[PDB]
Amino acid sequence: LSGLANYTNLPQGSREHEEAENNERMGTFMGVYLPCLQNIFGVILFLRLTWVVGIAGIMESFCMVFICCSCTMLTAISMSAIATNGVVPAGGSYYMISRSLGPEFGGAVGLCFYLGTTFAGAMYILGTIEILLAYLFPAMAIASGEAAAMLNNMRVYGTCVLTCMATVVFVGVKYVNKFALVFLGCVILSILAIYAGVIKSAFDPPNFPICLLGNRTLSRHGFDVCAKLAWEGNETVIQGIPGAASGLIKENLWSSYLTKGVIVERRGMPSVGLADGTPVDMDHPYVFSDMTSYFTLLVGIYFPSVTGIMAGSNRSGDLRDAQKSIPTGTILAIATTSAVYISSVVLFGACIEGVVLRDKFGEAVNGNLWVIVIGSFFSTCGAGLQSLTGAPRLLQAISRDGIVPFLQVFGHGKANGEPTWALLLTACICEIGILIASLDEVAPILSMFFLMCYMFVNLACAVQTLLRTPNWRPRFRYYHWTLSFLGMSLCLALMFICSWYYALVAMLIAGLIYKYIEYRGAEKEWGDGIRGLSLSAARYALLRLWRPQLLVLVRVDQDQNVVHPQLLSLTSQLKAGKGLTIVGSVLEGTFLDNHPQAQRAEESIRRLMEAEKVKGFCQVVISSNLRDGVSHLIQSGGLGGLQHNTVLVGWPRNWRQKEDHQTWRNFIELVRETTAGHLALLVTKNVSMFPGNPERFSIDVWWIVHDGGMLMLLPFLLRHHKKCKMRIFTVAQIQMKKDLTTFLYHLRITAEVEVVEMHESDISAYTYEKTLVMEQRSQIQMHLTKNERERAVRLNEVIVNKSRDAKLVLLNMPGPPDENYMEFLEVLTEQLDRVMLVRGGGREVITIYS
Amino acid sequence: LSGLANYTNLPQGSREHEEAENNERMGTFMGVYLPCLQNIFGVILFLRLTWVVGIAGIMESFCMVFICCSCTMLTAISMSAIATNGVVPAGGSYYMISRSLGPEFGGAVGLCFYLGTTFAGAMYILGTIEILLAYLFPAMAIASGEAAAMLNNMRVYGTCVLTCMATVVFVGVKYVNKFALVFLGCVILSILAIYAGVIKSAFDPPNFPICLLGNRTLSRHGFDVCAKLAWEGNETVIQGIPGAASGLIKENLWSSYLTKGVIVERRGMPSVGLADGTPVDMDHPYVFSDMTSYFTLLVGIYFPSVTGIMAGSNRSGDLRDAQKSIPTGTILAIATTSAVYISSVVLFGACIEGVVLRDKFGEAVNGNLWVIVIGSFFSTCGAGLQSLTGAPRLLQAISRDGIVPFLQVFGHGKANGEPTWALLLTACICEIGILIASLDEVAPILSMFFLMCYMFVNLACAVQTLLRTPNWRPRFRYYHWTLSFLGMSLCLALMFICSWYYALVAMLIAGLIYKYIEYRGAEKEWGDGIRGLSLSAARYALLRLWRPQLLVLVRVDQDQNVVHPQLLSLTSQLKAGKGLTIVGSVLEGTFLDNHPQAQRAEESIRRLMEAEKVKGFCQVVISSNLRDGVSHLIQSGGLGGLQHNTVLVGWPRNWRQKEDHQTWRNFIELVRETTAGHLALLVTKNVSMFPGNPERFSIDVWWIVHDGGMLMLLPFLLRHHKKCKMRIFTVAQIQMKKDLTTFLYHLRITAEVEVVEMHESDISAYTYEKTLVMEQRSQIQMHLTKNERERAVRLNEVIVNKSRDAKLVLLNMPGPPDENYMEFLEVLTEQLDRVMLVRGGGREVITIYS
């Protein structure tokens, strides 16, 4: 049989995910459209929507229906955005949200959706026997102005039918498997019946009114007359008159005003007159109003009729595509119901005084070809039985995963699915919602749970897009993060409109399970608890993943003692504890023989590191050769994207001292290593006589043609720690003075002067490098506030001492040559006291604060 | 002069921090106690506190004063906790909070405190000319039932005096330096005067009442009589009578009930009688009430009289100790004012009908030896002038640091401190608070700003203690994080009691500067912006800083290709993407010559790593020798506390094949390296024939006497990925079967059997190791759910094949011997198909889920 064979509305659950994953059909969109439509036409269309049309303006209830439509369509867009970033495995919406958001939003969404559905199981079981006591045969339990006796009347019948359909769901769930299609017919025939009844628009059951009252005609069947026969009659009930209008009009209503009664008698708008001035506290045959009916009390009664869209994707796996059927079988399925709730709210501009909630001559809607008062019974029974079976099967899915540890008992089952203890708990926490025993006070409770469940989805699917989580890539139309952010804001606003003093409490509870799952999850994988949390956060911040962040290469003395703490005193003030600093070292060979040496060395360097007030990490490597215990730090510094950008090192002071030292072959191989690794180098020459604690009271930099721009960030970073003047000294072989002055003034950096120096001959030059630098520069904008200049090696001229010997000096090193490394060791320390030779890499974009 | 020489109440600020830090006195506690007391006795004690005693119950206003006392004392405890974890440098409270919390809470506290003080400058300038228009000579600006003409009256005089003391603060701030002591006398003489007046308790200025009315005696000076002379008189104003009580009683009041008027006439509690039933909408000589006076409207009018405690530490640096004077000069200074507000609220149980706000015969308090109506003028002038000078000096301190980038203009000054544009902005945003022009509506605005400023301090100083930030160690009595958490909760509750729809808005604004400072701060130090944020978060989560987190040692083929992806398929299912996994490799030498080899190798291994669904980091090291390119990974794996706990490696398959291979000396040196590094080892023997994607359908472990407990975590981790049975097989040479069965059942792990095997001889044994393990075990509890057992090497018996050849096998390796490493290569692969040899370290606590 095409269609009706193998069709339900109940969700998939836990067992049909276990089967789909252990052993590792094909319904169309029409099997995921109709279940989204079946459980969304609930009970607030048949017996409370016309009261919303009556006890509020049509131009206010239109805005109510529109904003409650947008509040859930803008979340079904996020359901479209979640159904494409993965393989949409099996089970209901819970496994989708869990495997697409981690366990942490999955628990906080699943518990709120469970608390929503387990009060849906109360709100529909409480409105399915109002029909018995108001429209079918009354079987009440007792008079004399008793308005709270109906409360105790409805409690016992509600508890009886709750035990009835909690029994019939435990045994014989194949029965509600079988009856899954007639519950759709009982909705759709009744709604087509009332559209046909509006299309008739001819007849009316008339009412009977007083002068400006309602005169509820339960037993007053004398047809609006005090006395009319051959002799007079009693009709004992008077004050002014008694007319008889016809309520079910068809031509024109113009009921576009808000008439909010407050526990008083109903009144037609200017029928004849009114003439009294006294107390009117009688209890006679008149139709009163139940409670006050302001706006924010009414939106929380309307909102449970637009809920259940994530139960429109509970049929996963059994689809054939499941990545197009979930969006187009929900957005169409929410639009085809929004069309009903918007056309019907203005298409009830035919009745007159539909503000009476219960009855005037005992009829609910009365605009159809008496069908609706039994079609709206099996519909409400089925929508209260779907929310009964579905709710324990969600506790089984939450408890099965071990996401919550004290949810251990509730994954028991009876030999094939069929949750047992979860049905007991949902019966208890539905029973504590049935003792409230009024349909208008369980709706702002149920509404708030579905609002926070819809709000956490929009909060998650907009923060996964900003914070680029790796397994988060949606493949659907729209679903932009601004749209889900508007969904967040709209769901949060409609949460605080309903009841804010419950919104804060039930959001701080739902924002507290999200930390408890994080504690019990960060304990399982790291084994520590309070450290694994911080540790896990570091792992996520690395997996989700200019200014110099450096590795400093100090060496250790004959003991486990550092040899030049002035280098640490220079790197503390170059960087000021703002960034990444790896402080490495290297020892002799064979870790077996020397691990106490490295232990005491890292203890000493960690003692030094906090004394100079620098925040970083130490790594001490034991290696056989001294060279490849440095080239095994440069290649492997930080862990992930925390790569060191540059390497700082001291000059080899005792060069050419020993006979076969080979400690400067180490240095030249280091320079070639750092340059061919695309990495910058900072070598300090006279490592002693650098200031530590003591302050000072003219930093001079020497722009050679290469590697500039880095030459002016470093004094710009040094002056923030203990402040002198600075002298830019460029070299050339004209108009660049004005360009450099405008560049230094456009940054408004400091009091930097400028001197133009022209040298006929200066080595370390190559013209085919700016064309290699511009290929990387163009691969990266407008408003370029960066320094771009248009226009045997002796190096014994050395004009950089005629205006020098004042303060810290900076220069560019020449490029390394190959053989003849001893000829590369030219030393520019003819008279320079302290100097820090720099050498940049290739890719150095220095845009802001250069 | 001892005392009065060099004493102010104004805060320190920006310039006197710059001077204290560029050039790098001695007042006692009495110079930090009295400034905390001077600006806390504001204007709501003299002209609105008695209205709170009158228009609310004394047993409700007592609870009001008590909870507003606790709300700020429980924050001054956090001010004690912040004043000891550092060196309390200079400036006001802003530099303390900034340097002790980072810039991020510092900006969000400084802006809220600035917005609090700049409306203090309005609330005191608006209540300093109510005294002119109600108690001094009226100079009003126009009658005939005009209650809003007083509003427009007060606006122009308030704007005039605001321009007056905004002018006199810009030029001649040495004048308010000079007058800083008389403003304390004008408080303390007046409050001692009213205590002396209560100590008198003898006399009274009497009033004149109607039957049950107040009869405001502005011009009705006929002394409560209709006509009394030799002839009658008019007194034209009647209804019932006119008595004349005496208000200022002394014996007994018993006014302990809440009498909340709502825009009606005042009425004594049962004076004589009342006799009328009609409309009473006249405007005659009677004292009416201004507005409704419910409780949460009144706590937000009382709260601006307990504010200003962080201006009790604005005198930093100029103290001599500053680490004991700040707590004991604030807690005593808040207790000595709480004592006043609690004794005075029950010590106004002497007056009668003090519910009239403005005047009955033109007197404010009238319980002193007329002094108070001028002592409460200079006090309010000084407390409105302190909040004028202080507020721009705080914008200078916020703008100077560059914490906020668009606050660039407001650090201008005039040649020595003296902020100029900040005074213009605080004049404008005080002027938009003076146009509200009512003292009772600028107080729930000002109150909310000081409440969120007090709430962020309690939020910061309780999260710095849980999350162990390194430069956060307080050294003061109490200051426990539960106490500051109660401060958080109490400040948040008193925030939402006042005005919740402004609480959410002005908390989402103050929770939005905290992210803008984080964006503009994480851009300055990392240069990237959106990545530096995540990067910075990783750095903080590492600096703030059992289950195996492993480094796997794969090797690369003749190309840049991996050689055994089954090892990655084993480490994907051993760990399931939950933890840290470093996937290392090693190549030939000389990085210069081989960096494209390492580039393509890490590209290939990163291609493989995501294909097996394992989340980790790859590091590829080029080194000359193949050995110390492995021992330079084991010593330096992860960056900080993300150290790899164990090393996984494949067995050398082609052992003893080449003539001089020396690839197994590598392996034995690896085993000695890993054991003497206190690190665990996992070596897979037959690396091919391990399952990848395909599932399976009897894991057997072999407990040798050493290193157990780890032997049962690994199958317990393997079965969560694709599920067979398991066989525990221990060895001995009795009662341990029952102990092992109770241990395996107490964890309720799986269907593990148990076989006891006894061998007469088995090598790799030493008895003096459990005494070395128990020294580490005792250094770590109760309810020990861990496995603790009480009771030429041949290795050719090999009884581990009589019940074997089924599934994955696990064993303990023997300890390495020294020479004769080729004799250590005994192979237990007589018939075992797949086997993963394990070897633990020393420190393996395996408490939960073993």
Numbering used by the authors:
A (entry chain B), B (entry chain A): 85 to 108, 119 to 236, 242 to 336, 366 to 497, 508 to 683, 693 to 844, 848 to 872, 876 to 886, ...
Text lifted from the article:
Cation-chloride cotransporters (CCC) are central to the regulation of intracellular Cl− concentration and have key physiological roles in neuronal excitability, trans-epithelial salt and water movement, and regulation of cell volume. The CCCs are strictly electroneutral transporters, NKCCs transporting two Cl− ions coupled to the movement of one Na+ and one K+, whereas NCC and KCC couple the movement of one Cl− ion and either Na+ or K+ respectively. All CCCs are feedback-regulated by the concentration of intracellular Cl−—this is mediated by the WNK (kinase with no lysine)-SPAK/OSR1 (SPS1-related proline/alanine-rich kinase/oxidative stress-responsive kinase 1) signaling pathway. Here, using single-particle cryo-electron microscopy (cryo-EM), we report the structures of human NKCC1 (hNKCC1a) and mouse KCC2 (mKCC2a) at 3.5 and 3.8 Å resolution, respectively.
The mKCC2 structure is in a similar inward-open inactive state but with an inhibitory N-terminus peptide in place to block the translocation pore, and with a very different dimer architecture compared to KCC1—together these exciting structures allow us to propose models for the regulatory mechanisms of CCCs and to gain insight into the defects in known human mutations. In the case of mKCC2, using mass spectrometry we confirmed phosphorylation at the two sites in the C terminus (T929 and T1029) whose phosphorylation appears necessary and possibly sufficient to inactivate KCC transport function; additional evidence will be seen below from the blocked pore in the mKCC2 structure. Within the TM region of mKCC2, we noted a helix-loop density that we were able to assign to residues 85–108 in the N terminus, lying in a cleft between TMs 1, 5, 6, and 8. Residues T92 and Q96 from the N terminus interact with R443 and S444 from TM6b, while the additional N-terminus residues N93 and E102 interact with Q524 and R538 from TM8. The presence of this bound N-terminus peptide is a marked finding since at this position it is expected to completely inhibit function: in addition to the inhibitory interactions with critical TMs 6 and 8, the peptide completely blocks access to the otherwise-inward-open pore. Compared with wild-type mKCC2, a mutant with deletion of residues 85–120 in the N terminus was found to have increased transporter activity, strongly supporting an inhibitory role of this N-terminal region in KCC transporters. At the extracellular end, E224 from TM3 interacts with R142 from TM1b to prevent access from the extracellular side congruent with the apparent gate in hKCC139 and above in hNKCC1. Furthermore, analogous to the intracellular essential residues of hNKCC1, R193 from ICL1 of mKCC2 is close to D539 in TM8, forming a polar interaction, and from sequence conservation, it appears that all the CCC transporters utilize this interaction.
